[PDB]
Write a protein that binds this ligand. Structure first.
Ligand code: NI
Length: 341
């Protein structure tokens, strides 16, 4: 059965609710982004209307085989009527095609569902500026002050300089980047660009990237591994065993691997600056864990919420324990008393 925080009161709408069977009274199913926890349950046998971005719609059709008649793509930044209710989709600054949804309820209440997001000050100059929000359904993944990490631009700076240095010292080094879902593509794209290479990958991953509307993509990626010195591999293979095994397959073209594991936050954030980061090393194999987040830091989240001044907050992440729920409610109250709403 569908939980409460995935229902939109006063509408026939649900958000990210495909794993519960047929939801009683749902006339339109919204999908915020193509991440498995959120799409869990969609397939070619789905026969209700799905509302989403163009990019999410490209991925439903080609990767999950959902039939075209049930895919309803909406443009961003545009007032649209769905089943008699005004909605807007806004860029979530999460992975490609990810959105927040503004719902204008028939009774005058305004609801923002963030999906998954990385709050940014640029959101304070979207269509959100214009009006009040009564309920916020908030991505609270990192809602605790210990959760700190750098900007995405600092992390990319570190990865580009690390890769360029290592391959300039050894032209026979191979760079490898881990992936398991969409998102974080700037990591491997930026490194390939500095090195003058295309990014090499499997047919399945190439298919996924071709759904993302990335400008000039055909110039940036390929399935011909031999011609590329930046390779993608599944995240589970980013370890000394998996990487050794991959170096054997390359036919004596390379004598070193430098690899990157983009993670979310890890506890080495609590001590080490991004500048000071070091790899794990065995022989001619080195592995860097880099904290490239597509979710808000605690400070980013707090800033966004203090600016929006919602009348009520409903968390959508970390809701399963009493301790987590109590912790999050305490921070929402400090934020509210500090800013005076
Ligand atoms: Ni996500």
């Amino acid at each position: 059965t569908c939980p409460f925080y995935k229902k939109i009161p006063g509408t026939g709408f649900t958000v990210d609710a495909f794993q519960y069977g047929v939801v009683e009274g749902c006339t339109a199913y919204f999908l915020t982004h193509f991440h498995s926890d959120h799409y869990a349950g969609l397939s070619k046998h789905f026969t209700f209307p799905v509302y989403c971005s163009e990019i999410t719609g490209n991925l439903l059709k080609n990767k999950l085989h959902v039939q075209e008649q049930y895919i309803h793509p909406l443009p961003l930044d545009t007032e649209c009527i769905v089943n008699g209710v005004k909605v807007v989709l806004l860029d979530a600054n999460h992975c490609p095609g990810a959105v927040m949804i503004l719902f204008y309820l028939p009774n005058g209440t305004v609801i923002l569902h963030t999906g998954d997001f990385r709050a940014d000050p640029s959101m304070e100059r979207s269509l959100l500026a214009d009006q009040k929000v009564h309920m916020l359904y908030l991505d609270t993944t990192y809602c605790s002050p210990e959760y700190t990490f750098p900007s995405q631009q600092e992390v990319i700076r570190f990865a580009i300089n690390t890769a360029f240095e290592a391959v300039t010292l050894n032209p026979h080094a191979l760079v490898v980047c881990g992936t398991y879902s969409i998102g974080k593509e700037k990591v491997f794209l930026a490194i390939a660009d500095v090195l003058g290479s295309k990014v090499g990958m499997s047919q399945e991953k190439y298919k996924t990237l071709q759904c993302l509307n990335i400008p000039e993509i055909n110039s940036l990626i390929t399935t011909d591994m031999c011609s590329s010195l930046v390779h993608l591999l599944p995240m589970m293979q980013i370890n000394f065993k998996g990487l050794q095994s991959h170096l054997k397959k390359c036919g004596g073209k390379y004598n070193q691997i430098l690899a990157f594991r983009p993670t979310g936050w890890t506890h080495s954030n609590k001590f080490t600056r991004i500048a000071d980061v070091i790899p794990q090393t065995k022989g001619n194999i080195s592995i860097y864990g880099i904290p490239y987040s597509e979710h808000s830091s605690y400070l980013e989240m707090k800033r966004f919420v203090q600016w929006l001044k919602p009348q009520k907050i409903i968390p959508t992440v970390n809701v399963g324990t009493w301790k987590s729920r109590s912790t999050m409610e305490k921070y929402f109250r400090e934020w509210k008393l500090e800013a005076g709403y």
